[PDB]
């Protein structure tokens, strides 16, 4: 279980990075293409 909490933490932070980058790219595409 201790290892499980650490993996939950690592993946949650990874996912937030990937979502943030997707938000930034979505705003860029909207401005550059629309």
């Amino acid at each position: 279980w201790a290892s499980l909490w650490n993996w939950f933490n690592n993946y949650t932070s990874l996912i937030h990075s990937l979502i943030e980058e997707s938000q930034n790219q979505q705003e860029k595409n909207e401005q550059e293409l629309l």
Binding site: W1, L4, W7, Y11, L14, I15, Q25, K28, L33
Partner: protein, 36 residues
């Protein structure tokens, strides 16, 4: 090119979410084993 890059971004997000989902499945099975 920004559209193709955004498809990569969302795919990578979906992949990471799948790894988190599989970790929650593991925890549920482990909890069930200890409760029964």
């Amino acid at each position: 090119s920004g559209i193709v890059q955004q498809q990569n971004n969302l795919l990578r997000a979906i992949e990471a979410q799948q790894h988190l989902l599989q970790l929650t499945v593991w925890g549920i099975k482990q909890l069930q084993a200890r409760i029964l």
